[PDB]
């Protein structure tokens, strides 16, 4: 399991979690989806 | 695991390559731009230079005018509201004039004249860009293959927007400049002409689109499967055939019973790609002008039960 | 207003001439088309009405 | 007969099943265990298609059709005349495609090359199974699959696409279409560029990968490189097929109404949902 | 400056003839504008 | 304006000639098309109706 | 104020000039079209109504 | 306080100046479009209402 | 000196022949426009 | 600083000519705005 | 100095940029005052 | 338990533990706020008649 | 204490970046949840309190 | 307390400054949009209602 | 992953776990006082 | 130290992080105290 | 500490200047908030 692979699985799961959280908190699924995608992309693009 | 050569595991960067010059006018050439590590994980991370000749600048200016004209009309449809503009962006449309104007230029600006202006802009831009591709092939002494491959798609585009409206006698037939407006134009075109599925040239165009996907999956997989023998360097495998070319040929020789060469597979590729738009343009041209109901036509020509 | 000539020392004459020609042509076509768009200025239809043409 | 360079590659080995029982070449074709399997399945499928033609009462190649069982049979069997021949031919077709892929795996092993080709073919096989196995079973009826006729399977396509309005509004459909169209564009560009480099203006020297990099940087200010273009072609085709199978796995299973209404969620975003003006205001 | 390095006399003559052409074009345009306004004014 | 000649020393003559030929053809066909589209100046229908052919 | 010469010691005159020309033209055409949109500022419409051309 | 002169030791004027220009132009056009959106501040229509031009 | 690698005398000859062609084309255009405007004016 | 290769004197004369052009453009724009505002004011 | 600018030229650049900023701000203040006179927004 | 830091990469272990704990905490907090019996905002709103 | 070992292993830059992003996301979460509740929409609290709407 | 400055040693001044600028401007835009959303605090609406403009 | 290094890391991790768990336990007791769930 | 930081460096970074955290904690405690005073939520 | 090559005095001066900017920004923010509360309190 490469560093990139672990970062990718973590990005997916953190995207799901923060998307759920901001979908409930933000009043719509779109806000949660956008926040999750943004944070996960910023996480996965950055290496270790 | 076993490496599959889909991403470069190690990147290397060196001097900025400014390219060659056979008959290139160095003056119009730009300077090397930045380097993209993310995009370099898939290919050449270098950006630029960009050649900006006389047909190139003409194309840039005309395309800027076309896109900007569509944008201004979209803002007008928004009530100049940025929030609406970002809400109804897909649903906007710079529609052509309604059929009662026919081919006449005497249409109100709000009633399709602006569409005529933007269409002129895009026409000029695309034709100057075709000239640009031909000239850039000319400067480096290369064949004009990219120019003709572009001319195929240009002909489909001209049929959709210019030639078919002229033949039908109304600008109302042409495609609007909208996101879902042109999707709806496509679906309505099929419904009006009676199941475009039974257009033989629509079927041929789909055959060659499916064939382009099949052929590029096959060629990409083949070249990646022999990239361990330097299969990527296709030009040198043409000039000096290696074990990569022979293994690639023999795979398909033993699979299908026949094979290509390192050069002729690209002849297959270019023809498979250009037949898509060639047959598509023919089929759109015949629709309405010659056949108004493709399913009844199919019935009369086999192709469908009576 | 007696010093503009040296722009020809910072601008390639071929590039600027082509840019000017393209710009003037596009602008002229756009204005002629706008005039044709307006029913009060389309000279073909104006002469059609004044001379009683179809 | 062999190519002028073939003999040094026609060596034993690489076969998954057997190893000398079915290790030979009939003409150019490599016959393996899976070669035998795929020949049997394909011959059976073709003969059964012809037999279904005579049961249908037509010999027009464009009128021959082999329909699946009706919606009433659910996911069960069917008489040969009703939907059974279609089920047998689906068995034969699946077997033939899988055997073809595994025969390609054997050929890859014997030539010491990568397995990109059988993998890319497995993508097409799974799209086919999405249309004939996954979607019907998730829907519960073999009658939701397509018939085996040249123009009747287009009738299946049209009826399914209009069961959900204008199918153009499926977004997975949109990304799949963008992938297909850009894949065709990429194929045109790649073929043209390589042919232009290998074939110069007239009676002058052949060009170099640097020359084609230069051409595409002078054209669009960029070049992806000769390894990158083949990567991109494989990715575009495989992802087009993937999102094709995706657009037809969520259709009639997750979304049931006209797909256009999907795009309402964006225009009803509360901040600008109720603003007057615009197309939808 | 001096990206082209054209000798100042050459730039002088180039600008002079370019302005000759520009003045010619603007004069023809002025004549046409006057004719159009007289035929059918917009003001 | 007696010195307009030296522009040939700035732009390639072949370039200018082919570009102006393409431009002339395009402008001519565009004007012909505009005139054909308008009913007043569509000469074919003028000769059809005026000579009572239609 | 009387010191803006130091912007051109770093910026390229050619790029700055071409970009500003394009921006000025785009702004001008955008404003002209804006005025043409509003019927209270559509000079062709206003002249058509004043002189009874419709 | 007035010691921010070292910010250009941190940021090149190359990127900073273009970013400032595009940002300020974008804010200007955004706010002008906002004002054009609200009928209470669309100056062309308010002038039409004052001068009875509709 | 220049860009196209030409002199002034050959430029003069080329300008002369191009101007002769332009005047001929414009004169044929003028004759055609007169014929049409007499046939069917647009003013 | 001095990225583009222009020097102080070149920058000064370039700025002088560009500002002359800017003032000319601004004066033409001012007179055009005054004419339009007289024809139809917006305030 | 991550662009090769010394203290003097950095100071001079900041002074001229600030002069430009204050010029822009003065023009904006005049515009805002004039608009608020024409149509106050409070 | 001592070999956990050896077989398992400590960076992975720490990141996974932190992310999982944060997600589980927000999930349980959302579950509480969903039900009308442990939603502190609604309960206090009904308590002081502030809604 | 004894927690300074957490700074012997993890890179401070990514730790600080993640901390900033997480804190902004959490603060946005809390403010958005509060404005979601009509009982704590301070804007509407003032609107009713000062008789605005 | 005083030992805050060393964060500048840890972090890139350029990247930190760009991130702070983009984050701050996005935050300001979001808050202004939030205020505009409620008719309670849409200052254009309040001013128009108070001054009888709509 | 030396045994001493891993053991010290384990000691620190267990100490932090106990601290966080005690804080959570105090929170749980305060919550039960606020309202019982069982 | 496999990340490059030594015991003195680690102690310095940890102490600075703790002091910043406690300053944030004082600000947050004041904020929650003010919010509770304005209206209790318990 | 490192990771950027800076010195102690460079970090101190960069932080002091940045804090001057931050305090100016926060003071303007306080003034604006007070003005808004006066014009229309949200509390
Ligand atoms: C309900 C709708 C109808 C239908 C209605 C139509 C209509 C109408 C058309 C097609 C056409 C096609 N259909 Mg169909 N089609 C249907 C069902 C299908 C199905 C299916 C599985 O059901 C498939 C695979 C297809 C596939 C196809 C393609 C083979 C073909 C499009 C070729 C192409 O790539 O043009 C894409 C390329 C272009 C259009 C030209 C673009 C190139 C030019 C130069 C653009 C310049 C770009 C510009 C300068 C800048 C771009 C902007 C920037 C990027 C922002 N159709 C159903 C039955 N179809 C087209 C065709 O030709 O077939 C006869 C066509 O007109
Ligand atoms: C009426 C009921 C009570 C209540 C019932 C409870 C109960 C029961 C509990 C809490 C707990 C908490 N409550 Mg409470 N709580 C209430 C409502 C709230 C509200 C609100 C909006 O009203 C807020 C903001 C909070 C906030 C909190 C937190 C202070 C605390 C959870 C800590 C945590 O999740 O760490 C997780 C987050 C992290 C660890 C961040 C680090 C992870 C990052 C994101 C990813 C890892 C990367 C990084 C490099 C890894 C390094 C470190 C690793 C750990 C190795 N509560 C009401 C008032 N609350 C919990 C607690 O007390 O914990 C001690 C708990 O058990
Ligand atoms: C064989 C048929 C297929 C095909 C082929 C094909 N397409 C082609 C070609 C070929 C062979 C080209 O050579 C040509 C090309 O250049 O490709 C890269 C092209 C092309 N196909 C394109 C698109 C395209 N092709 C499509 C389809 C297809 N093309 C078919 C599938 C489609 C679809 C499916 O709809 C699209 C959208 C373009 C990428 C390109 C033609 C570009 C062109 O003509 O551009 C003209 C410009 C405009 C009208 C608008 C420009 C908009 C800009 C924003 C203007 C401003 C620019 C800015 C000032 C730049 C600033 C830069 C500086 C900061 C440096
Ligand atoms: C996944 C990306 C694209 C792709 C890739 C791809 N295709 C591939 C491969 C790859 C990488 C191969 O290696 C393999 C090959 O050998 O290519 C020459 C192949 C192949 N793709 C083929 C076709 C094909 N690919 C298609 C599509 C695609 N292939 C994708 C777009 C299509 C479409 C879109 O319609 C077709 C028709 C073959 C040329 C070949 C596989 C040949 C094969 O399966 O061999 C064994 C079977 C036979 C020779 C005949 C079997 C006959 C049946 C038993 C009876 C008929 C049943 C069928 C259901 C009838 C239906 C008829 C109606 C639908 C009209
Ligand atoms: C750069 O690199 C590259 C190359 O080059 C270097 C390449 O080239 C290629 C390849 C690309 C091309 C050549 C371009 C053209 C390709 C396409 C347009 C793609 C689509 C292709 C086709 C439709 C072609 C036909 C495809 C198929 C599937 C037909 C295959 C044929 C058969 C089904 C026969 C299979 C036979 C088998 C398995 C043997 C079975 C044997 C037995 C059971 C026992 C013996 C039996 C017998 C004696 C029976 C009779 C004889 C036989 C077997 C056959 C003859 C008789 C028949 C009845 C059929 C690529 C991609 C490339 O990138
Ligand atoms: C929807 O919103 C609307 C449009 C309604 C309202 C929004 C309006 C907005 C946002 C407007 C923005 C306006 C702006 C930013 C305008 C800026 C205008 C400027 C700066 C114009 C400057 C023009 C300068 C010109 C035209 C200079 C021209 C110079 C020449 C022509 C001379 C050529 C130069 C030479 C010869 C240089 C010689 C020197 C050397 C060394 C060669
Ligand atoms: C939507 O908006 C609408 C359309 C409604 C309104 C908008 C209108 C707008 C924005 C209009 C903008 C108009 C502008 C900016 C017009 C500018 C026109 C200019 C600058 C024209 C300049 C023309 C110059 C010409 C024609 C020069 C011609 C010169 C020659 C023909 C001679 C060339 C030969 C030379 C110089 C010899 C050189 C040889 C040697 C050896 C040096
Ligand atoms: C629905 O229910 C919800 C989800 C809303 C309720 C749930 C709430 C939850 C899950 C809350 C969880 C809260 C938690 C776990 C909060 C943790 C907060 C922490 C750990 C805050 C720490 C802050 C520390 C800060 C801000 C430190 C700042 C440091 C400075 C300002 C100094 C800068 C110097 C640095 C960064 C390094 C110095 C450099 C050298 C070389 C020493
Ligand atoms: C969804 O939730 C809503 C929106 C409802 C409410 C939630 C709001 C939230 C979560 C708000 C969050 C707000 C935050 C975190 C605000 C933080 C603001 C801060 C700390 C801003 C700091 C700004 C600092 C600035 C602007 C400093 C600028 C510095 C200068 C202008 C001076 C130039 C600097 C130089 C020259 C560096 C010195 C370098 C040398 C070499 C001397
Ligand atoms: C903020 O936004 C700004 C304002 C800055 C810019 C944004 C602009 C935007 C958002 C633009 C959006 C553009 C879109 C979505 C365009 C969509 C275009 C589509 C989907 C086009 C699809 C098909 C178009 C076709 C096939 C057009 C074909 C046109 C021709 C073949 C040429 C037509 C030529 C004609 C009609 C005759 C021309 C000759 C004369 C004399 C008028
Ligand atoms: C994977 C990333 C995206 C995650 C998407 C997961 C599916 C949806 C998860 C959230 C589902 C519940 O999320 C919540 O639902 C309620 C349903 O009333 C909606 O909330 C809506 O009604 C509630 C009352 O019920 C109002 O208080 C609120 O003002 C309004 O926006 C929103 O949708 C969201 O606040
Ligand atoms: C290069 C292509 C341009 C040349 C095209 C030549 C044919 C042009 C179209 C035929 C002329 C227009 O034909 C006329 O159209 C108008 C509507 O516009 C209508 O006039 C009634 C009738 O349909 C027809 O009398
Ligand atoms: C490969 C084996 C596939 C078996 O799949 C099954 O095949 C038989 C033919 O063999 C089909 O149909 C046949 O048998 C079925 C079931 O015995 C009989 O009702 C029917 O008279 C006959 O047509 C089935 O409908 C199909 O489900």
Interchain contact P11–N (C-beta under 8 A): no
CA-to-CA dists, residue D126 to D89, D119, D240, J16, Q8, angstroms: 17, 11, 13, 70, 62
Domains plus CATH for chain D?
Answer: 1-163 (1.20.85.10), 164-263 (1.20.85.10)
State how far the Cα of K37 lies from the Cα of B57, in Å rounded to an integer. 46
Across the strands, what pairs with B29? B51
The Cβ of residue B108 has, within 10 Å, a number of other Cβ atoms equal to 13
C-N interface (Cβ pairs under 8 Å ≥ 3): no
Does G44 sit within 8 Å of C38, measured CB to CB? yes
Handedness of CA P5, P7, P10, P16 (dihedral sign): negative
State how far the Cα of E40 lies from the Cα of E32, in Å rounded to an integer. 12
How far apart are the two ends of chain Q, measured CA to CA in Å?
Answer: 45
State how far the Cα of F14 lies from the Cα of D47, in Å rounded to an integer. 65
State how far the Cα of A33 lies from the Cα of L20, in Å rounded to an integer. 19
The DSSP call for residue D58 is: -
The backbone torsions φ and ψ at residue D104, rounded to the nearest 5 degrees and listed phi first, read: -65, -35
State how far the Cα of P20 lies from the Cα of C46, in Å rounded to an integer. 79
- Please name the residue whose Cα sits nearest to atom 42 of ligand 9: Q14
CB D236 within 8 A of CB D224: no
The backbone torsions φ and ψ at residue E22, rounded to the nearest 5 degrees and listed phi first, read: -65, -40
- At D24 the three-state DSSP class reads strand
Interfacial N residues in 1-40 facing M (CB < 8 Å): 7, 10-11, 23, 38-40
State how far the Cα of D198 lies from the Cα of B264, in Å rounded to an integer. 10
Handedness of CA D154, D159, D163, D166 (dihedral sign): positive
Secondary structure of chain H as H, E, C letters: CCCHHHHHHCCCHHHHHHHHHHHHHHHHHHHHHHHHHCCCCCHHHHHHHHHCCC
Tokens of D55: 């049961």
- Of the CA atoms within 13 Å of residue L44, those in its CB half-sphere come to 14
State how far the Cα of B260 lies from the Cα of B267, in Å rounded to an integer. 9
State how far the Cα of B85 lies from the Cα of B74, in Å rounded to an integer. 7
3-state helix, strand, coil in chain J (%, to 5): 75, 0, 25
CA-to-CA dists, residue E1 to B25, B176, G16, angstroms: 21, 47, 14
Classify D161 in phi/psi space as left (phi over 0), alpha (psi -120 to 50) or beta. alpha
Task: Name the one residue in this structure whose structure tokens are 């490189």.
Answer: D225
CB B121 within 8 A of CB B62: yes
Question: What does R_g of chain J's alpha carbons equal in angstroms?
Answer: 17
At E38, which helix (H) or strand (E)? helix E8-39
Q: Which of G20, G22, G32, G41 to mutate to test the pocket of ligand 6 (most atoms within 8 A of CB)?
A: G20
CA-to-CA dists, residue E14 to D9, F15, L48, angstroms: 71, 20, 86
- At D118 the three-state DSSP class reads helix
> In terms of CA atoms, which chain L residue is nearest residue M29?
L26
CB D272 within 8 A of CB B86: yes
Chains that touch O (3 or more CB pairs under 8 A): L, M
Omega within 30 of 0 (cis) for the link into F16: no
Tokens of B175: 């495609």
Domains plus CATH for chain F?
Answer: 5-51 (4.10.220.20)
Give helix G43-50 / helix G13-37 axis angle, nearest 10°. 30
Closest by CA to J3, choosing from G9, K12, K11, G3, is: G9
State how far the Cα of H54 lies from the Cα of L31, in Å rounded to an integer. 58
CB B216 within 8 A of CB D234: yes
CB L17 within 8 A of CB L23: no
CA angle D216-D217-D222, nearest 5°?
95
Residues of chain L with a CB closer than 8 angstroms to some CB in chain A: 11-12, 15-16, 19, 22-23, 26-27, 30
The DSSP call for residue Q4 is: S
The distance of Cα B30 from the centroid of its chain, to the nearest Å, equals 25
Burial H17-26 (b: 16+ CB within 10 A, else e): eeeeeeeeee
CA angle I30-I33-I39, nearest 5°?
145
- The answer for residues whose C-beta is within 8 angstroms of residue A4's C-beta and 6 or more apart is A47
Q: Is the CB of B276 under 6 A from ligand 3?
A: yes
The Cβ of residue D160 has, within 10 Å, a number of other Cβ atoms equal to 17
> In terms of CA atoms, which chain G residue is nearest residue B80?
G34
CA angle K12-K14-K16, nearest 5°?
70
State how far the Cα of E20 lies from the Cα of E9, in Å rounded to an integer. 16
Residue D184 CA: which ligand 3 atom is closest? Answer: 31
- H helix intervals, B53-144: 54-77, 82-87, 113-139
CB D238 within 8 A of CB D176: no
- The answer for residues whose C-beta is within 8 angstroms of residue B176's C-beta and 6 or more apart is B93, B94, B95, B96, B115, B182, B185
- At B51 the three-state DSSP class reads strand
The backbone torsions φ and ψ at residue D30, rounded to the nearest 5 degrees and listed phi first, read: -90, 120
Closest by CA to G53, choosing from C19, N30, C49, is: C49
State how far the Cα of I11 lies from the Cα of H53, in Å rounded to an integer. 59
- At A36 the three-state DSSP class reads helix
Residue D166 CA: which ligand 1 atom is closest? Answer: 1
O-H interface (Cβ pairs under 8 Å ≥ 3): no
State how far the Cα of I37 lies from the Cα of A1, in Å rounded to an integer. 83
Across the strands, what pairs with B142? D200
State how far the Cα of H27 lies from the Cα of M29, in Å rounded to an integer. 28
Its domain, for residue O19, covers 1-38
The strand pair at D29-31 and D24-26 is best described as antiparallel
- Of the CA atoms within 13 Å of residue P3, those in its CB half-sphere come to 22
The DSSP call for residue B176 is: P
State how far the Cα of D245 lies from the Cα of D129, in Å rounded to an integer. 9
State how far the Cα of C6 lies from the Cα of F47, in Å rounded to an integer. 59
Tokens of P7: 């015991």
Residue D186 Cα to ligand 3 midpoint, Å, equals: 11
Q: Is the CB of D181 under 6 A from ligand 3?
A: yes
CB B187 within 8 A of CB B213: no
Across the strands, what pairs with D200? B142
Cβ neighbourhood burial of G37 (10 Å; 0-12, 13-18, 19+): middle
Q: How many residues does this entry show for chain O?
A: 38
CB D218 within 8 A of CB B136: yes
CB D34 within 8 A of CB D67: no
Does H12 sit within 8 Å of K13, measured CB to CB? no
Tokens of N5: 């400055």
Closest by CA to P19, choosing from N1, Q15, N7, M6, is: N1
> From which experimental method does this structure derive?
cryo-EM
CB D271 within 8 A of CB B83: yes
Helices (H) and strands (E) in chain N, counts: 3, 0
Closest by CA to B24, choosing from B49, B59, B47, is: B49
- Of the CA atoms within 13 Å of residue P5, those in its CB half-sphere come to 23
- The answer for residues whose C-beta is within 8 angstroms of residue B250's C-beta and 6 or more apart is B259, D3, D6, D9, D111
State how far the Cα of B54 lies from the Cα of C14, in Å rounded to an integer. 9
How far apart are the two ends of chain A, measured CA to CA in Å?
Answer: 14
State how far the Cα of D214 lies from the Cα of D199, in Å rounded to an integer. 16
The DSSP call for residue D29 is: E
State how far the Cα of D211 lies from the Cα of D218, in Å rounded to an integer. 10
* Largest separation between any pair of C-alpha atoms in chain C: 57
State how far the Cα of B265 lies from the Cα of B271, in Å rounded to an integer. 10
The DSSP call for residue I7 is: -
- The answer for residues whose C-beta is within 8 angstroms of residue Q22's C-beta and 6 or more apart is none
CB D251 within 8 A of CB B72: no
Tokens of A13: 């799961």
Q: How many domains does chain O have?
A: 1
Across the strands, what pairs with D26? D29
Question: What does R_g of chain L's alpha carbons equal in angstroms?
Answer: 19
State how far the Cα of J20 lies from the Cα of J16, in Å rounded to an integer. 6
At D30, which helix (H) or strand (E)? strand D29-31
How far apart are the two ends of chain N, measured CA to CA in Å?
Answer: 55
Cβ neighbourhood burial of D105 (10 Å; 0-12, 13-18, 19+): buried
- The answer for residues whose C-beta is within 8 angstroms of residue E33's C-beta and 6 or more apart is none
CB B196 within 8 A of CB B186: no
- Of the CA atoms within 13 Å of residue H34, those in its CB half-sphere come to 13
Q: Domain of J41: which CATH number?
A: 1.20.5.250
The Cβ of residue F33 has, within 10 Å, a number of other Cβ atoms equal to 13
State how far the Cα of O23 lies from the Cα of D212, in Å rounded to an integer. 66
To the nearest whole angstrom, how far is the Cα of P39 from the nearest Cα of chain L? 9
How far apart are the two ends of chain O, measured CA to CA in Å?
Answer: 45
- Of the CA atoms within 13 Å of residue C28, those in its CB half-sphere come to 10
State how far the Cα of Q2 lies from the Cα of P31, in Å rounded to an integer. 35
State how far the Cα of M6 lies from the Cα of B44, in Å rounded to an integer. 39
């Amino acid at each position: 399991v490469s560093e990139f692979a672990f970062r990718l699985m973590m990005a997916a799961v953190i995207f799901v979690g923060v998307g759920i959280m901001f979908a409930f908190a933000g009043g719509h699924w779109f806000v949660g989806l956008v926040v999750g995608g943004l944070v996960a992309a910023f996480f996965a693009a950055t290496p270790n | 695991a076993e490496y599959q050569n889909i991403f470069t595991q190690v990147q290397v960067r060196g001097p900025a390559d400014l390219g060659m010059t056979e008959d290139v006018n160095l003056a119009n050439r730009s300077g090397v731009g930045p380097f993209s590590t993310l995009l370099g994980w898939f290919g050449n991370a270098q950006l630029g230079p960009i050649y900006l000749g006389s047909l190139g600048v003409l194309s840039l200016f005309s395309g800027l005018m076309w896109f900007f004209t569509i944008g201004i009309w979209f803002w007008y449809q928004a009530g100049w509201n940025p929030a609406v503009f970002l809400r109804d962006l897909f649903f906007f449309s710079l529609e052509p004039p309604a059929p009662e104007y026919g081919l006449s230029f005497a249409a109100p600006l709000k009633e399709g004249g602006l569409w005529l202006i933007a269409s002129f802009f895009m026409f000029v831009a695309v034709w100057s860009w075709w000239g640009r591709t031909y000239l850039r092939a000319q400067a480096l002494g290369m064949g004009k293959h990219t120019a003709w491959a572009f001319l195929s798609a240009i002909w489909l585009w001209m049929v959709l927007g210019f030639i078919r409206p002229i033949l039908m006698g109304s600008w109302s037939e042409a495609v609007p400049y909208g996101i879902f407006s042109h999707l709806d134009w496509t679906n309505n075109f099929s419904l009006v002409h009676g199941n475009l599925f039974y257009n033989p040239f629509h079927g041929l165009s789909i055959a060659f689109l499916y064939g382009s996907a099949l052929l590029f999956a096959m060629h990409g997989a083949t070249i990646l499967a022999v990239s361990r023998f330097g299969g990527e360097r296709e030009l040198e495998q043409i000039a000096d055939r290696g074990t990569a070319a022979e293994r690639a040929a023999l795979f398909w020789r033993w699979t299908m019973g026949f094979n290509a060469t390192m050069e002729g597979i690209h002849r297959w590729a270019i023809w498979m790609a250009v037949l898509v738009t060639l047959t598509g343009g023919i089929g759109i041209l015949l629709s309405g002008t010659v056949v108004d109901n493709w399913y009844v036509w199919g019935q009369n020509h086999g192709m469908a039960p009576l | 207003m007696s010093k503009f000539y040296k722009i020809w020392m910072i601008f390639d004459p071929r590039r600027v001439f082509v840019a000017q020609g393209v710009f003037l042509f596009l602008l002229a076509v756009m204005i002629h088309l706008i005039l044709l768009s307006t029913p009060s200025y389309n000279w073909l239809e104006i002469s059609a009405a004044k001379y009683n043409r179809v | 007969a062999l190519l002028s360079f073939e003999r040094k590659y026609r060596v034993p080995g690489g076969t998954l099943v057997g190893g000398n029982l079915f290790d030979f070449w009939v003409g150019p074709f490599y016959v393996g265990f899976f070669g035998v399997a795929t020949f049997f399945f394909a011959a059976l499928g073709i003969i059964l298609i012809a037999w279904s033609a005579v049961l249908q009462g037509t010999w027009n190649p464009q009128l021959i059709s082999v329909y699946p069982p009706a919606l009433e049979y659910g996911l069960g069997g069917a008489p040969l005349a009703k939907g059974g021949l279609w089920q047998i031919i689906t068995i034969c077709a699946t077997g033939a495609f899988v055997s073809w892929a595994l025969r390609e795996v054997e050929i890859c092993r014997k030539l010491g090359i990568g397995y990109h080709i059988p993998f890319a073919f497995a993508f097409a096989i799974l799209a086919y199974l999405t249309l004939v196995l996954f979607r019907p079973v998730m829907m519960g009826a073999w009658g939701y699959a397509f018939p085996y006729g040249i123009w009747t399977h287009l009738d299946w396509v049209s009826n399914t696409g209009y069961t959900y309005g204008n199918f153009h509004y499926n977004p997975a459909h949109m990304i799949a279409i963008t992938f297909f169209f850009t894949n065709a564009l990429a194929l045109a560009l790649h073929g043209a560029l390589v042919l232009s480099a290998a074939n110069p203006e007239k009676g002058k020297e052949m060009r170099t990968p640097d020359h084609e990099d230069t051409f595409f940087r002078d054209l669009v200010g960029y070049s992806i490189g000769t390894l990158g273009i083949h990567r991109l072609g494989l990715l575009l085709s495989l992802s087009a097929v993937f999102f094709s199978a995706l657009c037809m796995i969520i259709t009639g299973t997750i979304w049931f109404d006209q797909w256009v209404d999907w795009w309402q969620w964006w225009v009803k975003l509360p901040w600008w949902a109720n603003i007057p003006g615009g197309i939808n205001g | 400056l001096g990206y082209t390095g054209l000798t100042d006399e050459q730039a002088q003559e180039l600008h002079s003839v370019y302005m000759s052409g520009l003045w010619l074009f603007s004069a023809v345009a002025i004549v046409a504008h006057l004719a159009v306004y007289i035929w059918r004014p917009w003001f």
